[PDB]
């Protein structure tokens, strides 16, 4: 299919003809654009690409366009030493439609296409033109990405496709598997490919049942499965102990649970998926390789030499206690218990941080300090942390000043970035969401750092890039490498509440949220963890069962899991004060006896 794509794209580039395409987001179309562009650039013609938001209009188009050149016929575009200029549209249906269904970028495109022209908006006859420009873009189907009006597609040739086939998925991802497994211990090619066909079978049936209509966060995507295969090749490549395929199979099921148990909502979903997964593993190979993996997880710390690969429960306990105490040494302590689900959440944070470039999501209420668990996990990661300060002067200018400070402290020291935290409350001005989406996709913003700022930022990063070995002559590989390093450095976490109805509204209002981040469920509290905290706080068994059974019974009409935390605190108090009052009256009766006897 992409061979047909190549055949089309070659002649279209020769013709200098602007075209479009229809396809689902997350179908590697951005990656196909990257492949083609990096293959064709070779100092022949420049390029540009642009993302959109609903609160985008003709305005930002004119600016990000009008970046650079002064030729004849007024300020306009000229390929000095090149042939033309090209721009790309990441998302098409993104900009806001009025109640009549129009977007001012579409009318700007009317003007630019039919006249090759523009009118600068300051009050004058400042009416400029265009000489060399080519337009491209792509978009998924109508849901929920709007339809194109016939005034547009008549000037833009498109074509369609549909979801790839099992043979295609096997081709690409089994080729990646050939690479990775033939690198080290290739004696398991057949069972590995059969594991992948088990992936496809389970995928087919879970999508056959579970439809994306169930909830807004339901979606299955080519780039998701690419992330899966990438988590497969992430494994400790050495692992020269090929003694059981069950080792890589249990690891693989660990990545399976990483992918899907975080997302599952009904525990019936987890039942279905585990049933199908063990069914596939049994129709495939092995006797009890994955029949039960509640604890099994390839960790990092204390596994490698002097790390301080899979390990065990008391080792996890001791290492997590030691790291918590080391955090309490410098920072203020936070002694929320290291219960098994807290440690699993810590490991989830660990793997999310292990993934660089992209970010993830945290849809869970507060009360317990999820940000504090982030402090602990980022402390054991030993990386930089930051968070914006909320004030009455919650101005985009203030975020921008913090962001300039951020870019200074990320580019001049030439080190890891500050891992960021945001919550729903922290962001009152809805306009703040757009530069955050720019952080999500590009990791930087147009005109937030103008040209002189570009040069001043990349001054020292240039010389250090010559140290690592990128020439100064390219001057474009340089800047791409710099922003690539910025992405490799930056990590951000976004907290939400699942009760928020406008979470879906803003997810449709921003595609970068659902595409970039990963869906994890933070989920009715683990009842076993409730038991754990209950019988631990005896420091200050049937009762530890009993209060959780109470909460598990209240569910009939209405109930609240968080108030069960406040009820745990409330009855902890009530225990203390009731035993204290018991003591007070013991002493009152004792002294009654004293005076009686005297």
């Amino acid at each position: 299919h992409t061979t047909r794509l190549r055949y089309m794209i070659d002649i279209h580039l020769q013709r200098r003809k602007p075209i479009l395409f229809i396809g689902s987001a997350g179908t590697g179309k951005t990656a196909v654009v990257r492949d083609y562009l990096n293959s064709t650039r070779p100092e022949q013609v420049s390029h540009k690409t642009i993302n959109f938001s609903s609160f985008t209009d003709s305005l930002a188009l004119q600016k990000n366009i009008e970046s650079m050149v002064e030729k004849k016929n007024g300020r306009n575009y000229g390929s000095a030493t090149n042939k033309v200029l090209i721009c790309f549209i990441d998302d098409f249906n993104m900009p806001y439609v009025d109640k009549y269904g129009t977007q001012s970028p579409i009318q700007l495109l009317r003007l630019i296409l039919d006249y090759g022209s523009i009118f600068n908006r300051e009050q004058l006859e400042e009416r400029k033109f265009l000489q060399d420009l080519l337009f491209f873009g792509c978009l998924n189907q109508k849901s929920g990405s709007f339809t194109v009006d016939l005034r547009l597609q008549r000037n833009f040739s498109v074509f369609s496709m549909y979801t790839p086939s099992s043979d295609v998925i096997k081709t690409i991802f089994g080729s990646i598997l050939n690479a990775h497994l033939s690198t080290i211990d290739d004696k398991a090619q057949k069972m590995a490919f059969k594991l992948v066909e088990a992936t496809y079978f389970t995928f087919d049936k879970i999508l056959k049942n579970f439809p994306s209509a169930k909830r807004f966060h339901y979606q299955f995507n080519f780039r998701e499965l690419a992330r899966v295969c990438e988590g497969i090749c992430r494994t400790t490549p050495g692992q020269y102990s090929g003694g059981d395929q069950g080792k890589l199979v249990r690891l693989w099921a660990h990545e399976m649970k990483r992918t899907f148990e975080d997302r599952f909502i009904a525990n019936e979903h987890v039942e279905f998926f585990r049933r199908y997964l063990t069914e596939a593993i049994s129709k495939c190979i092995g006797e009890f390789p994955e029949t039960e993996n509640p604890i099994a997880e390839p960790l990092i710390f204390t596994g490698f030499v002097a790390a301080h690969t899979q390990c065990t429960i008391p080792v996890l306990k001791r290492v997590l206690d030691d790291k918590l105490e080391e955090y309490n040494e410098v920072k203020a302590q936070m002694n929320l218990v290291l219960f098994q689900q807290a440690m699993e959440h810590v490991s989830r944070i660990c793997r999310i941080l292990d993934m660089p470039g992209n970010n993830a999501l945290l849809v869970g209420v507060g009360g317990s300090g999820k940000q504090s668990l982030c402090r602990l996990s980022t402390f054991i990661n030993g990386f930089e942390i930051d968070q914006l300060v909320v004030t009455a002067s919650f101005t985009i200018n203030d975020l921008r000043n913090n962001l300039q400070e951020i870019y200074k402290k990320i580019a001049k020291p030439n080190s890891i970035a500050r891992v960021f935290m945001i919550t729903d409350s922290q962001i009152k001005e809805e306009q703040f969401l757009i530069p955050i989406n720019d952080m999500l996709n590009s990791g930087w913003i147009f005109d937030l750092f103008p040209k002189e700022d570009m040069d001043s930022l990349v001054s020292g990063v240039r010389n250090e890039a010559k140290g690592e070995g990128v020439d100064v002559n390219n001057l474009t590989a340089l800047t791409s490498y710099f922003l690539d390093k910025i992405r490799k450095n930056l990590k951000v976490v976004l907290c939400f509440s699942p009760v928020g109805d406008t979470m879906r509204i803003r997810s449709r209002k921003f595609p970068g949220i659902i595409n970039n981040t990963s869906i994890d469920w933070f989920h009715p509290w683990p009842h076993e963890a409730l038991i754990d905290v209950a019988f631990r706080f005896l420091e200050e068994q049937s009762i530890s069962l009993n209060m959780a059974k109470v909460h598990s019974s209240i569910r009939y009409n209405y109930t609240t899991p968080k108030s069960f935390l406040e009820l745990i605190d409330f009855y902890k108090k009530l225990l203390t004060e009731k035993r204290e009052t018991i003591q007070r009256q013991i002493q009152r009766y004792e002294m009654g006896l004293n005076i009686l006897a005297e």
């Binding site: 009152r588 002294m591 009654g592 004293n594 005076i595 005297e598």
Partner: protein
Amino acid sequence: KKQNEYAVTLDKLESDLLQSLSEADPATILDNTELIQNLDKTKKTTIEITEQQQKAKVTEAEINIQREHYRVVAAEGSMLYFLVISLSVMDHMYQY
């Protein structure tokens, strides 16, 4: 209201029981004649609590005999009132 104040009157005894060792700080308590009278006060309350129990029994039993005399029409007029209060939802201006 009288059985009300008398049960609060017991709280003073609860105080005077507590101070019996507290006001003297558990010292020189033997020669203090005031505690003996505090013991005699506890005896007064003991029969004052005995007056509380008899009154609670004789009166409140009679009070319920008085209360039942109309109780059924009360709970009647109770839910009858809540019903006519709920009439305003089906038509504006229908508030009393």
